[PDB]
Amino acid sequence: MKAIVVINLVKINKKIIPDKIYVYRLFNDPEEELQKEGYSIYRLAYENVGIVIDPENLIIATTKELEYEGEFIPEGEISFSELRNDYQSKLVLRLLKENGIGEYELSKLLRKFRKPKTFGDYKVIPSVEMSVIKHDEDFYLVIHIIHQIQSMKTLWELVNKDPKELEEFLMTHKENLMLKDIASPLKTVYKPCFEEYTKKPKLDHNQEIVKYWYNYHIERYWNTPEAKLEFYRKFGQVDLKQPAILAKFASKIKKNKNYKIYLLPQLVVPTYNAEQLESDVAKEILEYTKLMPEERKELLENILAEVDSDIIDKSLSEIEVEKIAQELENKIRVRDDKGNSVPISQLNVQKSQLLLWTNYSRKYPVILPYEVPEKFRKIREIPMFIILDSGLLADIQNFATNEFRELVKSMYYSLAKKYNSLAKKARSTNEIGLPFLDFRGKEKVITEDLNSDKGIIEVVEQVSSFMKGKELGLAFIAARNKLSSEKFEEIKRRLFNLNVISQVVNEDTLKNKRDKYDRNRLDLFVRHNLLFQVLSKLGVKYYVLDYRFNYDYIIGIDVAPMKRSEGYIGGSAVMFDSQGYIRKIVPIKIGEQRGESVDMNEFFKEMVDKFKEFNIKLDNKKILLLRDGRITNNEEEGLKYISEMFDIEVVTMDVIKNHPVRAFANMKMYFNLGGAIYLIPHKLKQAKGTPIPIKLAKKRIIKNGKVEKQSITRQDVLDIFILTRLNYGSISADMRLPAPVHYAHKFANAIRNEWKIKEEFLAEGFLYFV
Amino acid sequence: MKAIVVINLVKINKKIIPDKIYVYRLFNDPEEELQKEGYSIYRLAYENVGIVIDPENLIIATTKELEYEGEFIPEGEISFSELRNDYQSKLVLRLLKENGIGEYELSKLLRKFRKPKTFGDYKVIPSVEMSVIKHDEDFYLVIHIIHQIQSMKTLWELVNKDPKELEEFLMTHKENLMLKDIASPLKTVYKPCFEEYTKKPKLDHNQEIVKYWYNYHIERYWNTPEAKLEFYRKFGQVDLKQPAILAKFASKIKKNKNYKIYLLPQLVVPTYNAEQLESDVAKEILEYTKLMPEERKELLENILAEVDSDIIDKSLSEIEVEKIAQELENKIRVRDDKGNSVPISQLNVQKSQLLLWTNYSRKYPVILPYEVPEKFRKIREIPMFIILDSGLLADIQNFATNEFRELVKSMYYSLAKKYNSLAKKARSTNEIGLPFLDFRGKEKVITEDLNSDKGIIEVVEQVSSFMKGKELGLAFIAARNKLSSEKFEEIKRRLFNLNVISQVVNEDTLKNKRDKYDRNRLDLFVRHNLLFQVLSKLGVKYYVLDYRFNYDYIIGIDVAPMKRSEGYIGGSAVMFDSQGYIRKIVPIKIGEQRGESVDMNEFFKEMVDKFKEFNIKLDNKKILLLRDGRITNNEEEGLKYISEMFDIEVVTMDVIKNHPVRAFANMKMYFNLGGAIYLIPHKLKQAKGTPIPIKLAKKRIIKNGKVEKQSITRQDVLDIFILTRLNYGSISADMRLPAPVHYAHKFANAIRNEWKIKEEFLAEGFLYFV
DNA sequence: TGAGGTAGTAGGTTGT
DNA sequence: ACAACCTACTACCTCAT
DNA sequence: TGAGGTAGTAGGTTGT
DNA sequence: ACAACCTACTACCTCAT
DNA sequence: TTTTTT
DNA sequence: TTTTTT
Ligand SMILES: [Mg+2]
Ligand SMILES: [Mg+2]
Ligand SMILES: [Mg+2]
Ligand SMILES: [Mg+2]
Ligand SMILES: [Mg+2]
Ligand SMILES: [Mg+2]
């Protein structure tokens, strides 16, 4: 099918294209030839109305003649047609500013129809973001409406000038509080310092220090007789009862991490966080930053109407989109009562209703898991523990215990008996069957304070003592609402170290997610999701795709920052076929690295010993590589080297999720724009908000040490959309990313927290990190 | 016993002690109140004849009145007696320079009796290093004679100006070559850039670039008409046939690692490395930097004789040392023919002659291993592989194969049969016994190019295919001389991943270490060492100490850098007793960190689940903690927190191996100086050189959250000396560091290369990283 | 990389 | 010219009867 | 931390 | 005012007959 | 509802 | 000397 939709793009008149472009080459960084801190090769090319076409060799392209006080050589001339499309778009975007078409102007135009509002102590201000895209031979401007939230009160006029209140404020927001200094014209963000173990802030009470810093702020920046008037009006006199906060830089470009700083809690403001604000106010600050497609369309049309210039057009652009058929969603292969491989279509049911029979067994068909792991043939008995945070009230603890026990016995055991016996065990003897989750007897319910080291030590000691001689166990943790991080991660890591798979539920769910009719029971949605997630963590694949993929492997790659270091960690997820029609999932860990660039040589070496069929078994094996972000130049250069030796053919694509392009409709679709493909694979069930598409770009084929660029066809889009529909963490899931990228992200995040179990469950689809 | 020895210390006249010391406090870094190049708080205190007594708060102590162009406050006055001993010593050292007693003067005085020599293209220059120590109430100056090696030829006049020769030089020293720019007055060191995979340098041939850089060097630094004369005399004209080398900073303080640099191979020199120089010249450059104790004594006495000043004395100092008895070395507990526990004393044999019977069995007693791992009760079968680098000649390959097979069968199997049968298997049935190392049949000898990725892949494939269904194997690798790093480590890591323990021998050993009588056999020393190391890697402890230690555990801690990251890795080694008389070794991995400071909270949490007896079983457990280096303030602060909860008592000591203090004698001894203990535990078997002592300092006791400083007694020194004599990597070993620190270093280095086997052999004494 | 020792080259962290 | 210390790498030299 | 979506705050790497 | 993307964290809102 | 089933 | 011993 097809349709016509309106997108937030406006055409650009061709008269803006420059006639003559000069090219210059520098010999040294402008920051060193001269001495002006902050000056870079990009600022020099910006001030001359130009772009940087070679950052390594310092080669820039300019419209005017270069006005530089250093050393350079002119490399000649160039025409607009000899630049690449990206640089053409960047140059056109730069030229749009010289005609008054800038973000500073369009934001002011927008703020005539949407006014900056004030909620509590914060202000929300609309703004726009502008980009340029070359579709075929015409340039289009992309305008995206965003909001910014700022604080109108300093840290002094927030705690009512009581130092103790400042102490509570600093201590209760220890993890994620940052202070921005507004008295400076750089607006640098700092982080407060805290004492180890004992917590508590690090204040210093000394009048001389505060006097020196206040006078330094006056003298260094506002060094005119006039400016001191607004300095005294904005912040007042030199308050002396205010302590000084120990703080460090939030960034690291300056480096030299011995730079102590003293912050006066009178010239700084908190940045923004809804955790430090009342719920009734956070509800209305939100729902103002989210706009329906119609509101965006009317606002953009008004902005275009109130622009007086020939350069840009007066109406938004319309594009032709290709709709996605409904039949594509219903392409999964579940297994029925007997043990067949019936499509889910021929049961008059949808994927969401997959465990409705376990509570009724009279109105909905009985549906059984498609795949069960191999180690469950020998493993038939699994201990289960219930851990409860002592910070909850007794009624909540009893409710959580009862809910966990009922979930295990009433819901899981029915499936465990209908699968193991009714459909399997042909004559008193079968091999693969669902295990048994004990929870039997006392001393398996642990009630310790999970927010302290002593409680965690006691919990670990108890579980380890009970776990002697065993190899796989399950745990249900009922945690409090305010459980700090580095304690959640610690609990999960120390439980994984004993080969115990854990599932955590927080207090707010146990108190506000009660059922519709029976208000003394957990909601059906939550219970079904919990059972599905536990089954997926135990290695059971409840359904598989009915699609037939043309490749032999599908690999997703992602990179995550380290916890306490300056480095990065790579992670990947690999899906095999062995016929095309059925897939498995195995996570692969790539080593540490210095930047966001995966060493493709070490990845394939690690992907050879973890295999049996090799990458060159008998003939050429085709590999599909989806990259979260973009394929860097080093990754592409290192793929030709692998293709030279291993004799494989790689097809690489880039998946992007943060782009300013929007389509003003609510349906699953895709369209081709600027050489890339924008795909909306999901539908929004909430009233307020606009769906964010997925950008597929830069498809290329590498073989025999050669790279050939290609264009994305319809089959690739259909394959990506099909891979989108494979989620093992939620039955009623409508996600955006494809499965390999989605699970590579989670595996990288798990490695960041050093969550490893046995290295042998990973090979058979155990997904503890899901 | 006792003796009197001469140490390189000279007394200092008390008249130098200052009368009045001023104290000042700054408000901001002098690099920011003003704008200089590298001005710091330490340079400011140096130029005012003073020290920095508080770096965090910027509090400095000065002798003169402070002359500063910024903001500061005087904190009052202080007397010399109120400073700590370290700051008193630093102040006295600073005051020694104002009287002409500096390194620049004493080095010039020394260079009258030792002249700077020239070997090949390098120059060796003597110099001195000076320190100050306060022993009881008098200050002593420590003078240490060192040498410096510099290059008198640029990179241009080293390759005879042939660009191809320059390419060969750059490619053959790719790993460890650095270039220092001598045309600059900062003498900054750079590292050349190379192309990935394909290797080869990164040169740029362009006359304009070389002209610009040469003129920039002339203009920026030597900006006087006179200086250009020596610039033209030193380096010559602007040579134009010289390419430009791509290079980056060797350091990282500047950061911003996109700042490429172009180096002219005419203004830079190699720094120094004996790998790039002829062997006959490297032999004579060495043996000139090493001095016997007598030469050092005469040189220092001459230096003191030719000093005209009252400030320092005219003769070296004499100290009273306590000798170490011979009986202490012979305190190991080996096990005899029957299987008893006789001390090695009652056999008329020494530790080195521990396997002389396996070749004679008629002149020396038969000696059996004390301990054998528990996993060998079930394991009775071990595959053995022989891997040979294809870069060796055929005769060397055959010799290596024959030597490995003979080592396994003639030497090991005799022990394996005398232990398993003659002494064990009382009635046809025993449990613990030595396994069998196959090398059975062909297809267990692998000959592939180990310097390339293809050869490593093939080797891994073959070993993994043969290793199917097994759990422990052994490998002997015969590698070439020039085997580059990152290939050795890769081979070891990929072999460990298959649970194969490897031992590597290089080509130079197989060609020059032939036996005395039979020149077609490997030397006895090398063969015995190889067998001992293999046995230790397999978990067999051939001997244990006869000492009785007063503590329950001994823990050694070390920190190592990361390979591709900016971070650090902690490692530790723990020795248990369970009675005080016997010891086991278990390595413990501490997590990643940002600096050289181990998180003591996470270490003890990891040391609880890896235990069974806990740190608080029934009563107080004493822990001894030896730190490689020094205990940082954060580590000490985090130990009181642990002592508060876990109810343990920790005794911490600092072990230092790089200090300028020397004793002019050759015997095992120790003495007390400046509050620290200097211990010489080994004897030098080479003619040239002086033994380097071990500095034990800063003993302290932590319990109930309280820290009490203590003094090192004789029992602590005896314990450290006894722990020194426990090495499992060499039978004829006389090392310096204690065993826990020595093995913590190796475990940290192994973690740096990610060498992990199964996490279950680690807990029971396997030492694959030794 | 037989392993330990004594010699060099370069760089980093801590201090409190 | 900020002291003390760590780390990585390279080279020779000696070991038991 | 039921899991996914849409909204904010801050920071980093790549380009070639 | 260097684009164009990634990461970490926080908050609400909706889900299957 | 602090289990079954064999 | 590209093994035993059971
Ligand atoms: Mg990414
Ligand atoms: Mg990700
Ligand atoms: Mg989860
Ligand atoms: Mg260390
Ligand atoms: Mg070490
Ligand atoms: Mg070794």
* Distance (Å, whole) CA A133 – CA A140: 5
The encoded tokens of residue A231 equal 């300095």
> With an 8 Å Cβ cutoff, are A645 and B453 in contact?
yes
A59-62 vs A50-54, strand pairing mode: antiparallel
What φ, ψ does residue A15 adopt, rounded to 5°?
-70, -15
* Distance (Å, whole) CA B680 – CA B689: 14
Q: What is the 3-state secondary structure (H, E, C) of B211-244?
A: HHHHHHHHHHHCCCCCHHHHHHHHHCCCCCCCCE
Distances A433 to A334, A338, A583 between C-alpha atoms, Å: 17, 15, 21
Spatial neighbors of B230 by CB under 8 A, at least 6 apart, are B222
* Distance (Å, whole) CA B114 – CA B116: 7
Is A265 in CB contact (< 8 Å) with chain B? no
DSSP string computed for B29-60:
-HHHHS--SS--HHHHHHHTTEEEEETTTTEE
CB contact at 8 A, A112 and A306: yes
The encoded tokens of residue B70 equal 């910024």
A194-195 vs A189-192, strand pairing mode: unpaired
The encoded tokens of residue A337 equal 């009562």
Spatial neighbors of A282 by CB under 8 A, at least 6 apart, are A274
* Distance (Å, whole) CA A293 – CA A691: 9
Nearest Cα residue to A493 out of A755, A751, A762, A746: A755
User: How many Å does it take to go from CA A731 to C1' F15?
Assistant: 10
Q: Which residues of A79-115 are buried (b: 16+ CB within 10 A; e: fewer)?
A: eeeebeeeebbbbbbbbbeeeebeeeebbeebeeebe
What's the CA angle centered on A275, arms A270 and A276, to 5 degrees?
A: 45
| Portion 273-332 of B in contact with A at CB < 8 A | none
Q: Tell me the CA–centroid distance for residue B557 and ligand 4, in Å.
A: 8
| Cβ contact B685 with chain D strand, < 7 A | yes
Rounded to 10 degrees, the C-alpha dihedral A727/A728/A732/A736 comes to -20
| Cβ contact A409 with chain G strand, < 7 A | yes
* Distance (Å, whole) CA A618 – CA A346: 39
* Distance (Å, whole) CA B117 – CA B288: 9
The H or E element containing residue A502 is strand A500-506
Nearest Cα residue to B361 out of B298, B310, B422: B422
Is A460 in CB contact (< 8 Å) with chain B? yes
Spatial neighbors of A140 by CB under 8 A, at least 6 apart, are A9, A10, A11, A12, A132, A133, A134, A317
* Distance (Å, whole) CA A273 – CA A639: 43
* Rg of chain A on CA atoms, in Å: 30
User: How many Å does it take to go from CA A752 to C1' F7?
Assistant: 12
Residue B181 known to be catalytic: no
Q: What is the 3-state secondary structure (H, E, C) of B640-702?
A: HHHHHHHCCEEEEEEEECCCCCCECCCCCEEEEECCEEEEECCCCCCCCCCCCCEEEEEEEEE
Rounded to 10 degrees, the C-alpha dihedral A73/A75/A78/A82 comes to -120
Domains annotated on chain B, with CATH: 3-149+287-320 (no CATH), 156-266 (3.90.70.180), 381-537 (3.40.50.2300), 547-764 (3.30.420.10)
* Distance (Å, whole) CA B425 – CA B494: 37
Q: What is the 3-state secondary structure (H, E, C) of A92-158?
A: HHHHHHHCCCCHHHHHHHHCCCCCCEEECCEEEEEEEEEEEEECCCCEEEEEEEEEEEEECCCCHHH
CB contact at 8 A, A751 and A589: yes
* Distance (Å, whole) CA B193 – CA A266: 50
CB atoms inside a 10 Å sphere around CB A208: 10
* Distance (Å, whole) CA B469 – CA B737: 41
CB contact at 8 A, B459 and B450: yes
Sort A442 into a burial class: Cβ within 10 Å, 0-12 / 13-18 / 19+. Answer: exposed
> With an 8 Å Cβ cutoff, are B592 and A498 in contact?
no
Three-state DSSP state, A433: coil
Q: To which residue do tokens 């940082």 refer?
A: B632
* Distance (Å, whole) CA A722 – CA A333: 13
> With an 8 Å Cβ cutoff, are A592 and B562 in contact?
yes
Q: Which of B28, B461, B762 to mutate to test the interface with A (most CBs of A within 10 A)?
A: B28
Strand order in the sheet with A72-78: A50-54, A59-62, A21-26, A72-78
Q: Which of A59, A197, A254 to mutate to test the interface with B (most CBs of B within 10 A)?
A: A197
Name the closest nucleotide to A350, judged by C1' and CA: F16
Q: To which residue do tokens 């993890």 refer?
A: A175
Nearest Cα residue to A263 out of A195, A184, A335: A184
Q: Would the CA dihedral through B581, B587, B591, B593 be positive or negative? A: positive
Spatial neighbors of B369 by CB under 8 A, at least 6 apart, are B335, B415, B419, B535, B540, B541, B542
The encoded tokens of residue A574 equal 């690999």
User: How many Å does it take to go from CA A291 to C1' E15?
Assistant: 34
Give bridge partners of residue A506 from the DSSP assignment. Answer: A479
Nearest Cα residue to B477 out of B503, B459, B495: B503
What φ, ψ does residue A714 adopt, rounded to 5°?
-75, -30
B676-680 vs B669-673, strand pairing mode: antiparallel
CB contact at 8 A, A681 and A721: yes
Sort B618 into a burial class: Cβ within 10 Å, 0-12 / 13-18 / 19+. Answer: exposed
Q: To which residue do tokens 């394939």 refer?
A: A604
Q: Directed axis angle between helix B739-752 and helix B714-724, to 10°?
A: 50
Distances B483 to B389, B450, B489, B491, B508 between C-alpha atoms, Å: 9, 8, 11, 11, 12
What's the CA angle centered on B468, arms B500 and B496, to 5 degrees?
A: 20
Nearest Cα residue to B475 out of B541, B400, B410: B400
Nearest Cα residue to B740 out of B720, B713, B758, B717: B720
Interface size, chain A vs chain B, as Cβ–Cβ contacts under 8 Å:
98
Residue B628 known to be catalytic: yes
Q: Which residue of B has its CA nearest to A216?
A: B33
Nearest Cα residue to B444 out of B379, B382, B387, B504: B387
Nearest Cα residue to B590 out of B632, B567, B557: B557
What's the CA angle centered on A602, arms B596 and A636, to 5 degrees?
A: 115
The encoded tokens of residue A541 equal 């694949």
Q: Directed axis angle between helix A714-724 and helix A739-752, to 10°?
A: 50
Three-state DSSP state, B492: helix
The encoded tokens of residue A505 equal 């539920």
Q: Resolution for this model in angstroms, one decimal place?
A: 2.9
Spatial neighbors of B131 by CB under 8 A, at least 6 apart, are B89, B93, B141, B142, B144, B660
CB atoms inside a 10 Å sphere around CB B211: 12
Sort A741 into a burial class: Cβ within 10 Å, 0-12 / 13-18 / 19+. Answer: buried
Helix, strand, coil percentages (3-state) for chain B, rounded to 5, are: 30, 25, 45
For A230-235, the CB contacts below 8 A with 24+ separation are A231/A183, A234/A183, A235/A154, A235/A183, A235/A266, A235/A267
What φ, ψ does residue A268 adopt, rounded to 5°?
-130, 155
Looking at residue B411, the DSSP 8-state letter turns out to be I
Rounded to 10 degrees, the C-alpha dihedral A140/A141/A142/A146 comes to -170
What φ, ψ does residue B679 adopt, rounded to 5°?
-125, 125
The encoded tokens of residue A277 equal 């604000």
Q: To which residue do tokens 């003993």 refer?
A: B699
Nearest CA of chain B to the CA of A696: how many Å?
29
Rounded to 10 degrees, the C-alpha dihedral B160/B162/B163/B168 comes to -70
Sort A554 into a burial class: Cβ within 10 Å, 0-12 / 13-18 / 19+. Answer: buried
